[PDB]
Short mmCIF file of C-alpha atoms and ligand atoms in Angstrom, two decimals:
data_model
loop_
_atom_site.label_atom_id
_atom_site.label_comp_id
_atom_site.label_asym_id
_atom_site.label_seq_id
_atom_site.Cartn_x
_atom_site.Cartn_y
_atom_site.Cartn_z
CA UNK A 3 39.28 -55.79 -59.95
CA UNK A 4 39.59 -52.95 -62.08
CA UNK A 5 37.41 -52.30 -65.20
CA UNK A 6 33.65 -50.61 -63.88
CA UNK A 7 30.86 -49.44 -65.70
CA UNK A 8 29.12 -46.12 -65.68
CA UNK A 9 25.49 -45.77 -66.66
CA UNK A 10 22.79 -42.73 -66.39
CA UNK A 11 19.47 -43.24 -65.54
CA UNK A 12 16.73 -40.16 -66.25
CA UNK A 13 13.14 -40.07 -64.69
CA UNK A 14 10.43 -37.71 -64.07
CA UNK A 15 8.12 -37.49 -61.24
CA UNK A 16 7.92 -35.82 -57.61
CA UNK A 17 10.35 -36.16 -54.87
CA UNK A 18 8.29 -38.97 -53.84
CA UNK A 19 9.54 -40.72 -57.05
CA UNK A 20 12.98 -39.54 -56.86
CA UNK A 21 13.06 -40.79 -53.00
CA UNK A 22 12.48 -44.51 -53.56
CA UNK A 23 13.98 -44.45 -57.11
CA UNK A 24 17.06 -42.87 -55.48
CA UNK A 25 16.65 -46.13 -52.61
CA UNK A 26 16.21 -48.21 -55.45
CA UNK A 27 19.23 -47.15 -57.30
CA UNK A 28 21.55 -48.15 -54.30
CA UNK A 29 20.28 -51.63 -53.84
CA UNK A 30 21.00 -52.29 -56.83
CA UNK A 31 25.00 -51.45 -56.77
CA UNK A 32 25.00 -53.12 -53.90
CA UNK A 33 24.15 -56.28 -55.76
CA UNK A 34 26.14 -55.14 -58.70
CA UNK A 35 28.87 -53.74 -57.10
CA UNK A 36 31.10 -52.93 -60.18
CA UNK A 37 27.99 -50.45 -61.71
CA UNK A 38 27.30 -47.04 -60.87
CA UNK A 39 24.42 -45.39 -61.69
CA UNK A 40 24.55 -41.79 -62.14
CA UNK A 41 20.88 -40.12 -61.80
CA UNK A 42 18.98 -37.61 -64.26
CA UNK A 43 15.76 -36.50 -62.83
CA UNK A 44 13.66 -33.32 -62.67
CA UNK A 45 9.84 -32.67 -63.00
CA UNK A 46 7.44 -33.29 -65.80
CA UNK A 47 8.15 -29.61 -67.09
CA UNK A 48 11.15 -29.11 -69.61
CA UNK A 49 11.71 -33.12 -69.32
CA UNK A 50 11.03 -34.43 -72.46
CA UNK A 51 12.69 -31.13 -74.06
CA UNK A 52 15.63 -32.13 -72.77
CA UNK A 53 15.35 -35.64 -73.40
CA UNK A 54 14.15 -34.89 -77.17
CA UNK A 55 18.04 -33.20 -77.55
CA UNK A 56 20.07 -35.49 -76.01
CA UNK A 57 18.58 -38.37 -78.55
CA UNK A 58 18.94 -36.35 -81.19
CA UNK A 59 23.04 -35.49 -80.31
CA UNK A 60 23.26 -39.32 -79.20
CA UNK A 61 23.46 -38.69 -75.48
CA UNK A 62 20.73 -40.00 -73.74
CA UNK A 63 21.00 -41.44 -70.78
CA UNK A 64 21.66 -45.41 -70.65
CA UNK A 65 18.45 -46.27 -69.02
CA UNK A 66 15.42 -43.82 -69.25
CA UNK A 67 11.84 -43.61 -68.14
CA UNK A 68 9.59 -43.36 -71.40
CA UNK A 69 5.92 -42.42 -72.28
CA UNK A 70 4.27 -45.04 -74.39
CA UNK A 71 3.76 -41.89 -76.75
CA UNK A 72 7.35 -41.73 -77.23
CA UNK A 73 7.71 -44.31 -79.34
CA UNK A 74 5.73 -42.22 -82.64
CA UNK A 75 8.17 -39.02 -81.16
CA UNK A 76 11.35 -41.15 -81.42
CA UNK A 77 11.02 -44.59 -82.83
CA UNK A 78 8.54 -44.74 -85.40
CA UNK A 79 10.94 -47.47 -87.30
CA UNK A 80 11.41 -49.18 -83.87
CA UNK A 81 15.09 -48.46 -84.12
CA UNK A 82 14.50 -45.39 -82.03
CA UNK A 83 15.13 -47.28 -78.85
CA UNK A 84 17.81 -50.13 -78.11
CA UNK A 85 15.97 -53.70 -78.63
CA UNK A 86 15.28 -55.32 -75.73
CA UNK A 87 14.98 -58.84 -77.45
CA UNK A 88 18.54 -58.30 -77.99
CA UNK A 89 19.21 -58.26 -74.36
CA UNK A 90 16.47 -61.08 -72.91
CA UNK A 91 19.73 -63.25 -71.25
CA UNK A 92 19.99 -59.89 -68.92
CA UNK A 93 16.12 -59.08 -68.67
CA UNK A 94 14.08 -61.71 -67.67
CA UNK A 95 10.94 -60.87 -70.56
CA UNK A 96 9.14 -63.78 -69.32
CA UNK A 97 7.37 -61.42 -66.50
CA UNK A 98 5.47 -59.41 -68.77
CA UNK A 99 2.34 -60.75 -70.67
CA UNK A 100 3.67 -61.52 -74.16
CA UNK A 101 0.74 -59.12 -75.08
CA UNK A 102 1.28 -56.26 -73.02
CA UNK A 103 4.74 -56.07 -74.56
CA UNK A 104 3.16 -56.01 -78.25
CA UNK A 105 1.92 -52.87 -77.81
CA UNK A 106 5.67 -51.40 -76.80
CA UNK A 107 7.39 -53.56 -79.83
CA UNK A 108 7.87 -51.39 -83.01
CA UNK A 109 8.65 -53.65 -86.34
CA UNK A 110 9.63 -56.69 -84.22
CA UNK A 111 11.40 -54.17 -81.76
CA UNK A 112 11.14 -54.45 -78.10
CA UNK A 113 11.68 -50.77 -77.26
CA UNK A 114 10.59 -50.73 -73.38
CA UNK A 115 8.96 -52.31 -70.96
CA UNK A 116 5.82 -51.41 -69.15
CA UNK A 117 6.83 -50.28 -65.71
CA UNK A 118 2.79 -51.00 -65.25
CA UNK A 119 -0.31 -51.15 -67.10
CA UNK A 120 -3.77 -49.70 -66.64
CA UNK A 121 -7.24 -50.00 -68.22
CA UNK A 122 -9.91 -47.65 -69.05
CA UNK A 123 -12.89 -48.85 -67.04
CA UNK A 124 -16.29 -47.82 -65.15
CA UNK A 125 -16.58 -46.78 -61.79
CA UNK A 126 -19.77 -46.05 -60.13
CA UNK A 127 -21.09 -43.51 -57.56
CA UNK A 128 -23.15 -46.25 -55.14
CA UNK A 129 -25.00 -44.11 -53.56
CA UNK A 130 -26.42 -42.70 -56.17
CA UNK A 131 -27.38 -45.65 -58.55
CA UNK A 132 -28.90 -46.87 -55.33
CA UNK A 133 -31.17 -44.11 -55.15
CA UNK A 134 -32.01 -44.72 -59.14
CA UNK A 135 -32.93 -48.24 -58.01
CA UNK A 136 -30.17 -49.47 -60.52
CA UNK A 137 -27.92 -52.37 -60.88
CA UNK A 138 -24.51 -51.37 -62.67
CA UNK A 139 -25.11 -52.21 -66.55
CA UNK A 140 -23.87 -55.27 -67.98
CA UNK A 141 -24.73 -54.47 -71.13
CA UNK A 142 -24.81 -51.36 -73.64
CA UNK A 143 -28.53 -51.65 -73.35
CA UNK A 144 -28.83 -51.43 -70.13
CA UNK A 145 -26.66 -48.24 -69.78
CA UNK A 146 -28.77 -46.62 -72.50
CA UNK A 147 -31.73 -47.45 -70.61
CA UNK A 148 -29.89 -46.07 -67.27
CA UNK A 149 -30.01 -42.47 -69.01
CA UNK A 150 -34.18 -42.35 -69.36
CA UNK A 151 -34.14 -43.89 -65.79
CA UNK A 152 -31.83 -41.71 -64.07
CA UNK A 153 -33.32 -38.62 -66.22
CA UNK A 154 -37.33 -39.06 -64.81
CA UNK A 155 -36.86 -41.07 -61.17
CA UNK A 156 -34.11 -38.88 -60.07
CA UNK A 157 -34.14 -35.42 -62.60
CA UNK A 158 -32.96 -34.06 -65.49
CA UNK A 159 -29.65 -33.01 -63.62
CA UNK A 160 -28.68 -36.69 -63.42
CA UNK A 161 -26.86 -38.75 -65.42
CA UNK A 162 -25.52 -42.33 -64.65
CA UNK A 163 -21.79 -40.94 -65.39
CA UNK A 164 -19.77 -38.36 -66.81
CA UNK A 165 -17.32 -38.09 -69.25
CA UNK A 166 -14.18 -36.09 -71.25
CA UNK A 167 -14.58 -36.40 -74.88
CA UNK A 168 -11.38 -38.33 -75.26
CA UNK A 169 -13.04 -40.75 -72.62
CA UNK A 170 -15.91 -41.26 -74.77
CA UNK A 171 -13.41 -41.77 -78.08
CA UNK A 172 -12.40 -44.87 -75.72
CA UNK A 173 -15.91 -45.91 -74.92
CA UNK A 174 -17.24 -46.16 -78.20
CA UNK A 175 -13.66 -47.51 -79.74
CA UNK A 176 -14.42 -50.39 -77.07
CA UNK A 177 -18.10 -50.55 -78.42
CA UNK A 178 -16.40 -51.12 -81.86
CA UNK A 179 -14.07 -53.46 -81.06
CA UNK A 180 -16.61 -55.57 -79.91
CA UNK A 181 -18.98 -55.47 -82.84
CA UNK A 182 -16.18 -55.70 -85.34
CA UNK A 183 -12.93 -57.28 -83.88
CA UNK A 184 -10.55 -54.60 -85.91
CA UNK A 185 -8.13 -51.55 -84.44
CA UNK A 186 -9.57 -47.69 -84.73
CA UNK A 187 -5.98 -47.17 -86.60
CA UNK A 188 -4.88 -49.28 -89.51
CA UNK A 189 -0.76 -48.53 -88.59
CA UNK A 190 0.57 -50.50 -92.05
CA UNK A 191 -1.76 -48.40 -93.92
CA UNK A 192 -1.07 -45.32 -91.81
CA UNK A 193 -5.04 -44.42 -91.75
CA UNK A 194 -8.07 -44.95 -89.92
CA UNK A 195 -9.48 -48.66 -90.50
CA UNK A 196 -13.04 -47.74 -89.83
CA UNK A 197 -15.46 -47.78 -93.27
CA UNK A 198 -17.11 -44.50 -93.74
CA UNK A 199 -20.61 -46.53 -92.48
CA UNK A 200 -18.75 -47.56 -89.55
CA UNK A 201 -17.59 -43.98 -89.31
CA UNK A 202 -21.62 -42.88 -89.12
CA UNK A 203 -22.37 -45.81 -87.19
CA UNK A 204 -19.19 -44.72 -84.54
CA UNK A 205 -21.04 -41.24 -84.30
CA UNK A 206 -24.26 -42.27 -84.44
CA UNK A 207 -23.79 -44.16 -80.99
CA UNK A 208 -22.42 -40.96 -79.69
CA UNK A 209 -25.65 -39.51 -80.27
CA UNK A 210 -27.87 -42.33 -79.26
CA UNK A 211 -25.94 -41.95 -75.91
CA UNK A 212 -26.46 -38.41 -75.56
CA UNK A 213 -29.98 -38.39 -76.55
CA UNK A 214 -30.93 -40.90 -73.92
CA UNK A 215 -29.43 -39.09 -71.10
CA UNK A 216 -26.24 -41.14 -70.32
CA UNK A 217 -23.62 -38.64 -70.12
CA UNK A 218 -23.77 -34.63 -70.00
CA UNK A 219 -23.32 -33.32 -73.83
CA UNK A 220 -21.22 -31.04 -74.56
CA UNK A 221 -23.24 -28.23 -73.93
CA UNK A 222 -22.78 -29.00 -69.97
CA UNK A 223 -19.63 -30.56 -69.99
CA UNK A 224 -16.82 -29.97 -72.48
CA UNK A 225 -13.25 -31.38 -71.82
CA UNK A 226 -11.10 -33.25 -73.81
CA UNK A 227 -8.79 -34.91 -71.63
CA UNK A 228 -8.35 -32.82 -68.85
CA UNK A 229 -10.30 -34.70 -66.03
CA UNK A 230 -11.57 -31.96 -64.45
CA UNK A 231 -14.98 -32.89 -63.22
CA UNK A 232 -13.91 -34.52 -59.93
CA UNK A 233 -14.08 -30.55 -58.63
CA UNK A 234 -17.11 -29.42 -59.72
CA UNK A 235 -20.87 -29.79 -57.77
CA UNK A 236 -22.92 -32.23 -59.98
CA UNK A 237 -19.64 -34.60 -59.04
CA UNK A 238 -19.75 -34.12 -55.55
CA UNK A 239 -23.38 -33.45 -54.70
CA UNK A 240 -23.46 -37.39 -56.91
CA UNK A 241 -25.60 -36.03 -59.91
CA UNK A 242 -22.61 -37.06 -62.23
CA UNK A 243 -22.67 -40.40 -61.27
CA UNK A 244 -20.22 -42.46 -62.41
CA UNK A 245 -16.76 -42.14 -64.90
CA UNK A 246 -15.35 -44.01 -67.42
CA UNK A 247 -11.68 -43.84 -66.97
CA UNK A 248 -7.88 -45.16 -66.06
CA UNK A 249 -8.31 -47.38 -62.98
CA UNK A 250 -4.89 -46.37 -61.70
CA UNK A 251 -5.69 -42.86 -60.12
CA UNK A 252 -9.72 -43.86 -59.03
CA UNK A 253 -8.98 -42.77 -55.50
CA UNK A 254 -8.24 -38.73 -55.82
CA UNK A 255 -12.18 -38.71 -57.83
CA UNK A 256 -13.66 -41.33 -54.90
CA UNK A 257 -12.99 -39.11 -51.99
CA UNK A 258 -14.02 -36.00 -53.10
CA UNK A 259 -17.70 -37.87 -53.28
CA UNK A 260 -20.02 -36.70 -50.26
CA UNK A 261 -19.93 -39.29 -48.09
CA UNK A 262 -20.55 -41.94 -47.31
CA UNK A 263 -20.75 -42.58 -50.89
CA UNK A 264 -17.49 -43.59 -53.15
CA UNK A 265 -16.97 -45.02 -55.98
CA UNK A 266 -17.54 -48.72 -56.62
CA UNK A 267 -16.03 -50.93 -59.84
CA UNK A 268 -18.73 -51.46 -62.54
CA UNK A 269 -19.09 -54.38 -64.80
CA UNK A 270 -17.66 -53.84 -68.30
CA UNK A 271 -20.62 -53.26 -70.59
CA UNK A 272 -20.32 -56.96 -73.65
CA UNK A 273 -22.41 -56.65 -76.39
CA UNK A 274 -23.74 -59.98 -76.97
CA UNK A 275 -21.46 -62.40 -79.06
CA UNK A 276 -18.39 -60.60 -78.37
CA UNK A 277 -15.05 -62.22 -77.84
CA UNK A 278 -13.25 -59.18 -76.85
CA UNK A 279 -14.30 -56.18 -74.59
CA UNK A 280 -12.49 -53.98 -76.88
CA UNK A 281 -10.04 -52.58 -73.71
CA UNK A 282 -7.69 -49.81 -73.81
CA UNK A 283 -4.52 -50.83 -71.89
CA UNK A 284 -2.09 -48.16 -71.63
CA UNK A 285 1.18 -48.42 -71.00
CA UNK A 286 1.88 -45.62 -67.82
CA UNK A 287 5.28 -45.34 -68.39
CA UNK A 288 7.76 -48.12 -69.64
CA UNK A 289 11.70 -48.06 -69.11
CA UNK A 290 13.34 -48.62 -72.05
CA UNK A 291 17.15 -48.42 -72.95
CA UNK A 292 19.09 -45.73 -74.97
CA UNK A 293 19.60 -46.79 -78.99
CA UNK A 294 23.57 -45.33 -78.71
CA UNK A 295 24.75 -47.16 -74.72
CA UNK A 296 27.81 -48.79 -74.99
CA UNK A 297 26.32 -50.63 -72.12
CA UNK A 298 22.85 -52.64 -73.02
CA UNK A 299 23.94 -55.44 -70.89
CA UNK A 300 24.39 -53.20 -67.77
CA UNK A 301 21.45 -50.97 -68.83
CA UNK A 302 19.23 -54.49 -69.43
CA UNK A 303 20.41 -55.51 -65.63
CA UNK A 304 19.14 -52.13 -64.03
CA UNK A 305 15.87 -52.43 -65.54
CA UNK A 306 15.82 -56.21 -64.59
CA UNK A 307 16.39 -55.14 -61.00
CA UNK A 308 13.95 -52.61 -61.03
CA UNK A 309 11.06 -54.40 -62.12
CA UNK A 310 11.69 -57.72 -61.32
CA UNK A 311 14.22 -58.49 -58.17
CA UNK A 312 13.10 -58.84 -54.69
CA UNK A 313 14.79 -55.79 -53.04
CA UNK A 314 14.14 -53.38 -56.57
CA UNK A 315 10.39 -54.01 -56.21
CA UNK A 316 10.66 -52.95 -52.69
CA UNK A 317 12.09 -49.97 -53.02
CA UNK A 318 9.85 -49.16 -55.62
CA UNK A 319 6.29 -50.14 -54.30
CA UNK A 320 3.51 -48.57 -56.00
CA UNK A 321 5.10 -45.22 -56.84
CA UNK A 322 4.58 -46.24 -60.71
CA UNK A 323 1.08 -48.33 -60.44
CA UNK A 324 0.84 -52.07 -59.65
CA UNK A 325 3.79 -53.49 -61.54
CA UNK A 326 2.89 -54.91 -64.86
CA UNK A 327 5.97 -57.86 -63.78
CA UNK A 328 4.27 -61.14 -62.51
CA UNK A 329 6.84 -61.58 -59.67
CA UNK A 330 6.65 -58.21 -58.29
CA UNK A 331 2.86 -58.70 -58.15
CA UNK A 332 3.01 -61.68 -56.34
CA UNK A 333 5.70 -60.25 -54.08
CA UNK A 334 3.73 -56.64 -53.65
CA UNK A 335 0.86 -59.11 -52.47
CA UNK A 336 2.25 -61.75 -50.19
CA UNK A 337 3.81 -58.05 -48.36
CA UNK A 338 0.20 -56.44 -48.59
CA UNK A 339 1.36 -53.48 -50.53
CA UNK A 340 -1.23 -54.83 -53.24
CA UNK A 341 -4.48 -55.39 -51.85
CA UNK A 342 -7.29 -56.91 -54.05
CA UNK A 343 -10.05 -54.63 -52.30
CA UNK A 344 -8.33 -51.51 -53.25
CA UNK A 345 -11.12 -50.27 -56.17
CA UNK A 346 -7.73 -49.39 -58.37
CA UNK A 347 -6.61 -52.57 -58.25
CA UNK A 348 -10.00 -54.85 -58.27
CA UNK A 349 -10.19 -52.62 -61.57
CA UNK A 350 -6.93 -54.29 -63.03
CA UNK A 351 -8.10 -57.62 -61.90
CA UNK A 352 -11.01 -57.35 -64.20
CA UNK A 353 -9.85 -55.88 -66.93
CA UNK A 354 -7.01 -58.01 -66.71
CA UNK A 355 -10.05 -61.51 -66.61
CA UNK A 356 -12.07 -60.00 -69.47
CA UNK A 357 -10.58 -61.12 -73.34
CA UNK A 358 -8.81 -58.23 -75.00
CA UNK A 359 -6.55 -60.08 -78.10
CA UNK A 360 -7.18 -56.74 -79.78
CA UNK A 361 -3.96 -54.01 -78.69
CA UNK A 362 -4.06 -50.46 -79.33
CA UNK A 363 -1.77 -48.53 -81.54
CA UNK A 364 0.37 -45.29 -79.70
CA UNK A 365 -0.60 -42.71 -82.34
CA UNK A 366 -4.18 -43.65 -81.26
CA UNK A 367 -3.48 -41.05 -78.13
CA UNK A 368 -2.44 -38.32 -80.78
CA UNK A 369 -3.94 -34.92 -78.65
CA UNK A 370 -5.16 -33.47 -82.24
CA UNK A 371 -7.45 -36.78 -82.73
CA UNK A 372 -8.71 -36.13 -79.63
CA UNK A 373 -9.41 -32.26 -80.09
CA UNK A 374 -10.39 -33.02 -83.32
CA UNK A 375 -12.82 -35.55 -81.61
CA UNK A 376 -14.34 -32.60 -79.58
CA UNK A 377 -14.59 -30.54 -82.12
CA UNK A 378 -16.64 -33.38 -83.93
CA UNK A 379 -18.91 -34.15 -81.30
CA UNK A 380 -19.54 -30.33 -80.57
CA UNK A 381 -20.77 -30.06 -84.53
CA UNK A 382 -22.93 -32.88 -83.27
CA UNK A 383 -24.39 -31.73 -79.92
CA UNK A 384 -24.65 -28.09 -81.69
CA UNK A 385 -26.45 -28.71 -84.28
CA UNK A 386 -24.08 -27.63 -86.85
CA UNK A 387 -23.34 -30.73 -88.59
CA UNK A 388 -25.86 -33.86 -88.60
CA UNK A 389 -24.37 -36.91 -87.71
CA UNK A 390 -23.23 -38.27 -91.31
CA UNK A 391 -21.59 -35.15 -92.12
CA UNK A 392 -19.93 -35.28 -89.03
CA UNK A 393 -18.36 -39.06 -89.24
CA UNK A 394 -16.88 -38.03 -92.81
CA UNK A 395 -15.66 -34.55 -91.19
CA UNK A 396 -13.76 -36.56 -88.79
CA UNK A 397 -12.88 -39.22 -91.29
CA UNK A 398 -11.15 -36.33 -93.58
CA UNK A 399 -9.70 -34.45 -90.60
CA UNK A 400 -8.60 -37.53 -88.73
CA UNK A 401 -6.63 -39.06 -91.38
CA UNK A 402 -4.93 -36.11 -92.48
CA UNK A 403 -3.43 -35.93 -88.95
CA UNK A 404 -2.36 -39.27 -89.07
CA UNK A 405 -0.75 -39.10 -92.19
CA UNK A 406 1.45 -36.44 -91.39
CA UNK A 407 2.00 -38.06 -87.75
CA UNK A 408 2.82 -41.56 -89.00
CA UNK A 409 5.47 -39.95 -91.82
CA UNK A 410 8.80 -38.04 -90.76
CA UNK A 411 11.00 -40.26 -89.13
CA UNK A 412 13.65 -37.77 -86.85
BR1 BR B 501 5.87 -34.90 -62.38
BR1 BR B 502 -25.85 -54.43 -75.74
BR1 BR B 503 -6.02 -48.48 -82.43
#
């Protein structure tokens, strides 16, 4: 009878994305027969451009696929987004660990949902460690000793992994976490909660690390996010031997190995006495709803269906990552779209198994804190500042960008 609703949807992605999300879309009016959904999708390019003006003017689409790093852009009061607790009789919240959904709430706002979630982790070239003679470490100790073993049984040319700067920010955050239970950003305070000794002692480890032959310096390999070493010869020939990195994409770096060597999950490095590894679980992209729909019931039903319903999962697969939603995972698996053996997914598992009660904040991923972090640890590995001057350089730096981030609410 009469009366239907009208709701737009935007997404990025390749026409592999727009494909099942387009499949998706129409199982879901079939089941809700009385909603349309009108579709908004392009490429990465110009996307959140576009997206940035219609939330200013108040016409964003009803449903949209966000970046966790949206929510500093738009929402830094949490009202940037519509609240999803306001909604939970049309989304069914109970599918998503309570603490995974933490890390997308802004002042007791629920502003989206993790589509899925993945960890930074370490991932091994076999081959290699099994010519170094070398169990994966289980311990921080034991991948400091790697370096001096990997540097005189196998050469100078080897290290037991390789890593971006903003991978190593991640590493030694973890490291921190586990020593001292408290987040790199203090968000209330809108600084950096490290003390300035914890600030040398942060740095410090950087150094330790580098001197003892666990990673490349920056002198050989210099990237800050941009994981571009999966190309290059000491990668493939297996003298950069290992990665420390999202578990969600693992297979693009295992198959360029020579084979038949791939990559294999480590063990997560736990100092001793620690009750959390200290992980970083990102958010890959969450749906969340528009602040201005005169639809959040509607808009809360799509994104139900999505993530959670039988046929919505379907459609979807693992074009996003393994679902963060228990009963797609359990559906994904029972059709053998998941499989436990996949190295990606084994990854989750683990990370998923190890304690992490300590979340990380979004303006942690600011891409000046992580320049800034290569520019720190290139004063560092070039001699131009010693350690100590270094951890108050970044200190200064790093707050100042912070500041100014965590202020100016559009
Ligand atoms: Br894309
Ligand atoms: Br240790
Ligand atoms: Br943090």
């Amino acid at each position: 009878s009469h009366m239907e609703v009208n709701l737009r949807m935007s997404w990025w992605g390749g026409n592999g994305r727009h494909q099942v999300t387009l499949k998706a879309l129409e199982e879901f009016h079939k089941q809700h027969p009385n909603i349309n959904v009108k579709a908004e999708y392009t490429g990465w390019d110009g996307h959140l451009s576009r997206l940035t003006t219609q939330i200013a003017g108040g016409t964003e689409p009803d449903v949209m696929q966000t970046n966790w790093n949206w929510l500093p852009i738009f929402s830094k009061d949490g009202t940037g987004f519509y609240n999803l607790f306001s909604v939970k009789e049309q989304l069914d919240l109970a599918q998503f660990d309570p603490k995974e959904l933490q890390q997308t709430t802004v002042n007791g706002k629920l502003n989206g949902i993790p589509i899925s979630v993945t960890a930074m982790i370490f991932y091994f070239n076999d081959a290699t460690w099994a010519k170094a003679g070398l169990e994966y470490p289980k311990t921080w100790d034991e991948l400091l000793a790697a370096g001096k073993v990997f540097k005189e049984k196998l050469g100078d040319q080897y290290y037991p992994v390789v890593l971006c700067a903003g991978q190593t920010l991640v590493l030694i955050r973890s490291y921190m976490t586990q020593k001292y239970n408290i987040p790199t950003i203090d968000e209330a305070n809108k600084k950096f909660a490290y003390s300035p000794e914890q600030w040398v002692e942060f740095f410090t480890m950087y150094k330790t690390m580098v001197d003892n032959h666990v990673m490349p310096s920056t002198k050989y390999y210099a990237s800050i996010v941009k994981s571009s070493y999966y190309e290059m010869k000491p990668w493939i020939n297996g003298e950069w031997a290992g990665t420390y990195m999202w578990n969600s994409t693992i297979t693009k770096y295992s198959d360029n190995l020579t084979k038949p060597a791939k990559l294999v999950l480590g063990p997560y490095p736990m100092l001793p006495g620690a009750k959390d590894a200290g992980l970083f679980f990102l958010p890959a992209q969450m749906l969340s709803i528009g602040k201005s729909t005169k639809h959040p019931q509607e808009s809360a039903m799509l994104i139900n269906f999505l993530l959670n319903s039988k046929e919505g999962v379907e459609a979807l697969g693992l074009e996003r990552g393994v679902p963060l939603s228990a009963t797609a995972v359990t559906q994904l698996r029972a059709s053998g779209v998941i499989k436990d053996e996949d190295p990606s997914v084994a990854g989750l598992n683990m990370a998923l198994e190890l304690p992490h009660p300590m979340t990380t904040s979004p303006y942690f991923l600011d891409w000046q804190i992580w320049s800034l972090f290569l520019d720190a640890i290139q004063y560092i590995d070039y001699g131009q500042k010693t350690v100590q001057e270094t951890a108050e350089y970044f200190n200064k730096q790093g707050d100042r960008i912070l500041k100014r981030a965590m202020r100016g609410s559009l």
